[PDB]
Design a protein around this ligand. Structure first.
Ligand SMILES: [Fe+3]
Ligand SMILES: [Fe+3]
Lengths: 392, 168, 515, 136, 392, 74, 131
């Protein structure tokens, strides 16, 4: 017999359920059963995603979109508000307008990544039992993949940490969700690169999955010099949370990151007989496209076309793009020196091949981001600036 | 009468001792064919081991089967009955038999006897199974022709039962 | 080219793949079924519900997550597994384990339909069905697994896959929804498993029962069974396609009415008394009279929406229907006499009808009180419930000339001197063996097909042996090795042991020795 | 509508009155019925579909529909046909809801079931036997 | 007010809950709460897989391992039993012994496949958005992948339908589960091949995803003549359910199937710049290794080492292997004619490269299956038999 | 080589990746917090529960599935 | 054991007797405790672990353990440390059960929590401060 009462449940205990039934009215006291029915729906019907996310952030009317009133109850020493307009240069009539087109609240997001988590481990168990690593090119495996794909994990890790102040500073709930999920996918990319290296180490005697050599390459090899400078600036040089998100995902990761992940490591895997690396880059590229859907909605649909501040916001976005595209072009110009270390494959690692890869990256970027904010870009000029770093 | 326990009894033990003395494929084949004619199907000769014959048959089958893999060349396992006959010839002979049967009573006895004589391990499994299916098709078709046509009193006569009781 | 491509986000939906499935088959001489069949008509039909393997898994996994959430989280936190009236918790020992064997045999029957299908879309559909019946087998097991962990009497929930072999009701279960499906014409399964089994009997058996479980405090069974039957939609759909093909060819249509009637009778012969007995006697709170449930689902809705509608195309109302309706009204009360009388051979604890039950039985089946009620009350006065009484009703039946026979075809017990349902004893000797048959439909089956029907019965296997020795040998005991699983009351005191059974001196006879 | 009640007709009678009709000579053969039956297991999504689709627009299109509460499930009977548009349900639920998702809760049917687009239908028609009434 | 009673729930209705509480004993009536506690556990403790699966099949004592007694209630016309020993040449002391090492009952099986189903569609939506198809070799895409990978789906489809008679005839629950899950994985493989082709059709104007050319190739091209002949025999030529499973998975699919899926289409995808196909073969190879674990337990642990019939069974397994290995060697000899149509890549498609691929396949097969049943095999002899079909 | 390899089934467990996380950081002058604080002490510590992104999602999704089953179904 | 009851000590008193001790001068500062508290939400897996692990082997090894029924959760309090081995739980449940899987039902802690191998422990020890 325990010291405390064994509480009777009102759902099942006869005496308490009878008391409850006598208390419960015999009719509903209102007919509006839609949770937060007053949200303005983005789509033809209010979504559960919106109902659970929108106006969770308790902004007052002096932050655009807020429904509350009055000052915060406690501010920073000196007076910095809990959240405030000073956090970013961009302006809008309603910070709540943003919608992730994938409609991710927490549950669908961890549900999908759980699928990938478990399937990845079944895939590895079977890939090791298959022996398929036997046909990978050993120089690619040991000298290019291990070392420079490994070093790329530090770019992903830095973009992850650039989100820390965004998670604190940004001004609405759907934005904060978009940013935090983007950060987890970036640190996931870094962890999956290391997971692949650790996995190859179990199959290839003498293959070293220590990060010592990748990290030396990230921190001191000229090939990653421009890239590391840009990441360091996006992560720790600025605090405007819109600038971090734009520079990080819409400029740097969409040009340098897409080139490194998709045009170098993923594409060249399927020229050097690497049946393992495409399984891993499939995940980072899926994540990139999901993140882009949300980044695009925040900056194109909402901020670049806001009825009162669209042109104002394009002034800042165009200035950020000019600076960070220069940084990213310099990163790519450094990075294409890596082609001097790979076995020549016509149409892939020769000058024409690299030129067409750069034409894809800069051309896709012009369509996906630059045209949508009014940023003029000469693609051939950017391709030629990077090719100045290519050793013929 | 008083039955012994279900799964362990003197009848099964006594038959296992007989089975243990089988030493050749010819001896075991004759033993299992006589057993199945004596003790299986509604036309069996004897119900004296009714609750044990199915277990005993399995033990005869296991003995015959092991003798086959020990003694016979591989090709015989695939293409011959353990009677010595060509398996494909046995199949053609019994399908023709049942297709020539003039009534469902003739057809049933041919099908039943084919199983008593050739059920594996006597015949190879693949040949047996497809022959058994071809026979069963014919037998089903002839029995399901005017299934309700004969009154019960007529069916009792044609089957040949001794009617012991009919509740009013 | 290398620069230009449509980058609109696209995938491939299941119906886009499904479009191409019919083309996956190819022609060769040996491409035909392995199983014997009477049905040889054209059957190149389309699948209504367009499922592929990946979509199959997504649908079923979504069902499972909600079901196991409810069971393992919510209902366990409520303690719901021990909030069941004892009669109904005992009942689920047999409903769930007996249905499990039906589901298991449906796997094999569906594999025969898969084999005898000639269109790639129907092979695809029958594999999904094959998989569903594995699912259902595991769902039925999970109910007894859950009861074993959470209900006040795990015995019999925890070992029916061996303890069911002791008793006579299990024998007929191996025919109803089991041998009757898989041991016969492979295309005909579309008639007996699907047009009859799935379209007629699974609704009362699996859906209607959930309301009875709910009435008696059981929310575990509705959680699982209502998910089980969501799969049945695709199964009926599979079989309907082949029934249409059968109806369209005069050579194969000429077999359909006989197959339908034999299927209907085979299934109802056991289903009608056994489920009626389990619903009405295995419950405290009754949802409605069993004969009304049967009328709603079997006679009016299946009979009218399936068979009556198909009457426009030559399908005949089963000739055995009148005999069946008589069983719907009385056969489950007949069975209750046998089941109460032979209680030591089961794996469940039984409850004689109480005063409230008796008034309900008599109001809804006038004549019940004077026939069955008086027997149950005499058995109670004789010490039915009391382990020191030395009384077991099967012996009393024999002393009063109320012999129990086992139908050689259906394995259903029959007590001609007390039965009000359909039946009359016919005893034949053939080639030195005596056989008891109990109705016109089964007797015909046995006369035409004696080698299909050689099932040993409990009296042939147990002849001359004492009851407690049979029960002990079949493991019919609790973990102490002496208290019986089965009991003649549902209370926690005065449980019967093997020695209490032995005290009654009940020895199995040969019921046909007198003939 | 009344004739589609779960307890319609003979099911209203008890005792000897029930037996007399149940054993009446004319009730020893099946009778053709133009009805369909559809069972949905109770759940958050299904209970919304019953209240706002089936019992509103559904009954407006087909006044013979009867919906009965059977504890763990809804029992639905109607003349001719019952249809549910999965797209209408997803609109009501505010979350993805295909026809595949509606079937997760269709727990029993009596009738011919088919799908045309996003609509799930059970019908009295014998598809492949009944002949089309229009060339359109 | 509905015509029928609104039934009161005994769990929540005060009066029915109180009646039930009065009826329920105040103590458990037994302490054994382990569902089917008497199953012999294969592992340290009984698994839920075993509890839910084992002895569901109601076999009598005259089928080795059965716990029931007496004849079946209804047999086929003629007397064929519902299940019986005549179904297979192999013998055992206990048909229930088999255990899938993945412990798959229905639930974990569809959970895993559902993960793959949903992730596959996310991957495809991102891959089309990525534009990654742009760098595939067009000749590989149109003349080898579309046509001959398409044609491979008929091999998977035929192996799928070989299981239909196995699902009806096999003699225990755990074996039936193994067989049916293996069947669905095979038809999944065929559907996934078609899904890849239909996906490429949406991205490449003029690419024809119709099965017409693949079906003509499977039914009439000499490259698939031996393969189709073997599949037809295993599917429709035999009914011994053990022979089907062994010949299907342990011989034909483990030699021809693995060469075609892994050594040809998967491996060569990663020399011709194909970033799409590895995602699909990743699934078929995971399925192969999962099925192999179950097939291995049945034929090696249970049947080839059955205490009484092990040598008896190896006599049959050896004869089947002799026959179906000759069929598969002939299939492979036809199939390597396909190398005459591909662009030469040193170490992959030349004679030395094809020879090393056959050495992996026959060498792996000798370790995984032949050595375990005592089947003698000269690996170099089999590689040379197949290389006779290789056009230099 | 091209023929010989260990074909034992292996994957990579979360704690095997977690062991390398501490090395993911790198030194540069600006690598410090952006927020005001009074606390400037050494704080190079180890995480007790070794989770990575994939394992985080697996755990939380397994909690969610039971929760939403209980709510939306039972 | 009794001092680890949910209603131990002052929690036995009601009315004025409770108020007099609650406001006693010596009770206006916290008092160091060597206990730990562990809360597990009720579920199929957790209830088996409670009955067959915590209340047998756990309580034999730590006799100060008290387990109380709090409707939706189990409330556990013990001197020093509480430990649960996930490998033992997996053996009991018949299904895979990693240390990660054990956390899904660990709803609350008062104490320092860590994992070593397959064991989960909550301890009074102040790791990194204590020796
Ligand atoms: Fe089923
Ligand atoms: Fe079914």
């Amino acid at each position: 017999p325990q010291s405390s009462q064994v509480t009777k449940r009102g759902l099942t205990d006869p005496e308490r359920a009878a008391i409850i039934a006598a208390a419960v009215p015999d009719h509903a006291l209102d007919t509006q059963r839609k949770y937060h029915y007053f949200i303005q729906p983005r789509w033809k019907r209010l979504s559960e995603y919106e109902q659970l996310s929108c106006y969770a952030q308790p902004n007052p009317d002096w932050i655009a979109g807020g429904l509350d009133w009055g000052d915060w109850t406690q501010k920073f020493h000196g007076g910095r508000p809990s959240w405030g307009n000073e956090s970013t240069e961009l302006r809008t009539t309603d910070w709540y307008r943003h919608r992730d087109p994938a409609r991710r609240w927490h549950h669908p997001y961890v549900k999908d990544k759980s699928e990938e988590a478990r399937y990845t481990q079944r895939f590895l168990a079977a890939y090791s039992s298959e022996g398929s690593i036997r046909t990978i090119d050993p120089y690619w495996r040991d000298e290019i993949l291990n070392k420079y794909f490994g070093a790329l994990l530090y770019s992903e890790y830095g973009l992850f940490n650039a989100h820390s102040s965004v998670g604190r500073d940004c001004l609405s709930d759907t934005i904060r969700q978009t940013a935090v999920f983007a950060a987890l996918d970036k640190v996931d990319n870094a962890q999956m690169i290391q997971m692949e290296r650790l996995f190859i180490a179990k199959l290839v005697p003498g293959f070293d999955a220590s990060t010592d050599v990748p990290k030396k390459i990230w921190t001191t090899d000229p090939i990653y010099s421009g890239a590391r400078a840009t990441v360091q600036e996006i992560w720790q040089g600025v605090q405007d949370w819109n600038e971090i998100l734009w520079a990080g995902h819409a400029v740097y990761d969409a040009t340098f990151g897409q080139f490194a992940r998709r045009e170098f490591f993923q594409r060249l895997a399927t020229v050097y007989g690497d049946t393992l690396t495409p399984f891993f880059t499939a995940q980072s590229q899926t994540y990139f496209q999901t993140t882009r859907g949300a980044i695009d909605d925040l900056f194109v649909y909402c901020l670049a076309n806001d009825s009162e501040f669209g042109a104002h916001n394009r002034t800042f976005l165009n200035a950020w793009t000019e600076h960070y595209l220069a940084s990213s072009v310099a990163a790519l110009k450094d990075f294409v020196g890596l082609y001097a270390k790979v076995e020549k494959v016509a149409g892939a690692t020769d000058r024409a091949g690299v030129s067409e890869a750069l034409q894809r990256v800069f051309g896709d970027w012009k369509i996906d981001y630059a045209d949508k904010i009014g940023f003029r870009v000469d693609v051939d000029q950017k391709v030629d600036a990077v090719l100045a770093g290519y050793k013929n | 009468a008083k039955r012994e326990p279900i799964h362990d009894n003197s009848i099964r033990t006594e038959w296992e001792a007989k089975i243990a003395k089988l030493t050749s494929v010819d001896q075991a084949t004759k033993f299992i064919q006589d057993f199945r004619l004596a003790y299986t199907s509604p036309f069996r000769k004897s119900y004296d081991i009714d609750v044990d014959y199915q277990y005993i048959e399995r033990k005869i089958e296991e003995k015959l089967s092991v003798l086959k893999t020990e003694k016979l060349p591989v090709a015989d396992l695939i293409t011959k009955a353990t009677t010595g006959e060509d398996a494909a010839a046995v199949e053609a002979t019994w399908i023709a038999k049942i297709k020539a049967a003039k009534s469902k009573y003739e057809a049933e006895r041919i099908h039943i006897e084919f199983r008593q004589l050739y059920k594996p391990p006597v015949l190879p499994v693949n040949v047996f199974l497809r022959t058994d299916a071809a026979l069963g098709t014919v037998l089903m078709e002839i029995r399901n022709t005017d299934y309700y046509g004969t009154p019960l009193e007529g069916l009792r006569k044609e089957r040949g039962v001794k009617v012991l009781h009919l509740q009013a | 080219d290398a620069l230009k491509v449509n980058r609109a986000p696209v995938g491939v939906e299941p119906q886009e793949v499904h479009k191409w499935l019919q083309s996956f088959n190819w022609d060769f001489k040996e491409n035909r079924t392995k199983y014997p069949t009477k049905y040889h008509m054209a059957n190149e039909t389309k699948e209504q519900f367009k499922v592929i393997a990946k979509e199959y898994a997504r649908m079923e996994a979504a069902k499972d997550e909600r079901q196991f959430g409810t069971l393992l989280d919510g209902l366990t936190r409520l303690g719901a597994g021990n909030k069941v009236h004892p009669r109904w918790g005992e009942t689920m020992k047999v409903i769930s384990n007996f249905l499990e064997v039906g589901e298991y045999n449906a796997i094999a029957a569906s594999a025969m339909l898969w084999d005898s299908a000639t269109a790639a879309e129907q092979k695809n559909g029958y594999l999904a069905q094959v998989l569903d019946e594995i699912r259902h087998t595991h769902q039925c097991a999970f109910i007894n697994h859950y009861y074993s962990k959470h209900y006040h009497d795990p015995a019999g929930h925890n070992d029916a896959r061996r303890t069911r072999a002791i008793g006579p009701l299990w024998k007929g279960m191996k025919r109803v929804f089991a041998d009757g499906f898989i041991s016969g014409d492979a295309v005909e399964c579309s008639v007996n498993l699907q047009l009859v089994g799935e379209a007629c009997f699974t609704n009362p058996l699996i859906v209607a029962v959930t309301e009875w479980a709910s009435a008696n405090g059981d929310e575990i069974t509705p959680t699982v069974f209502l998910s089980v039957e969501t799969d049945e939609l695709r199964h009926m759909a599979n079989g309907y396609q082949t029934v249409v093909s059968i109806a369209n060819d005069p050579a194969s249509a000429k077999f359909l009415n006989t197959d339908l009637n034999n299927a209907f009778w085979t299934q109802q012969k056991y289903f009608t008394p056994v489920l009626g007995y389990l619903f009405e006697y295995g419950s405290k709170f009754k949802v409605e009279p069993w004969v009304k449930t049967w009328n709603r689902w079997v006679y009016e809705d299946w009979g009218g929406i399936w068979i009556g509608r198909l009457g426009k195309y030559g399908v005949e109302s089963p000739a055995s229907l009148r005999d069946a309706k008589r069983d719907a009204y009385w056969a489950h009360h007949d069975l209750a006499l046998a089941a109460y009388a032979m209680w030591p051979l089961g794996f469940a604890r039984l409850a004689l009808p109480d005063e409230e039950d008796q008034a309900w039985f008599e109001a809804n089946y006038p004549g019940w009180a004077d026939h069955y009620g008086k027997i149950f009350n005499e058995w109670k006065k004789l010490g039915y419930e009391d382990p020191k009484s030395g009384f077991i009703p099967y012996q009393w039946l024999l002393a009063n000339g109320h012999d129990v026979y086992i139908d050689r075809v259906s394995q259903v017990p029959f007590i001609p001197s007390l039965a009000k349902g359909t039946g009359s004893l016919r005893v034949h000797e053939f080639n030195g063996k005596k056989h008891s048959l109990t109705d016109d439909w089964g007797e015909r089956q046995w006369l035409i097909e004696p080698e299909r029907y050689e099932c040993h019965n409990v009296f042939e296997q147990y002849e001359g042996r004492e009851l407690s020795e049979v029960i002990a040998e079949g493991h019919g005991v609790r973990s102490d090795g002496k208290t019986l699983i089965a009991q003649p009351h549902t209370r926690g005191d005065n449980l019967w042991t093997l020695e209490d059974i032995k005290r009654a001196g009940c020895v199995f006879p040969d019921p046909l020795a007198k003939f | 509508s009344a004739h589609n009640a779960y307890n319609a007709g003979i099911m209203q009678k008890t005792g000897k009155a029930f037996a007399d009709e149940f054993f009446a000579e004319e009730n020893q053969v099946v009778h053709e019925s133009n009805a369909v039956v559809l069972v949905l297991m109770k759940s958050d999504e299904i209970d919304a579909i019953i209240e706002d689709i089936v019992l509103k627009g559904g009954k407006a299109k087909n006044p013979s529909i009867v919906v009965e509460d059977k504890a763990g499930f809804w029992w639905i009977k109607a003349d001719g046909a019952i249809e549910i548009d999965a797209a209408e349900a997803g609109e009501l639920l505010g979350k993805p809801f295909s026809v595949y998702d509606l079937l997760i809760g269709v727990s029993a049917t009596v009738g011919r079931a088919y799908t045309l687009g996003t609509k799930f239908t059970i019908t009295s028609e014998l598809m492949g036997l009944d002949r089309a009434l229009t060339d359109i």
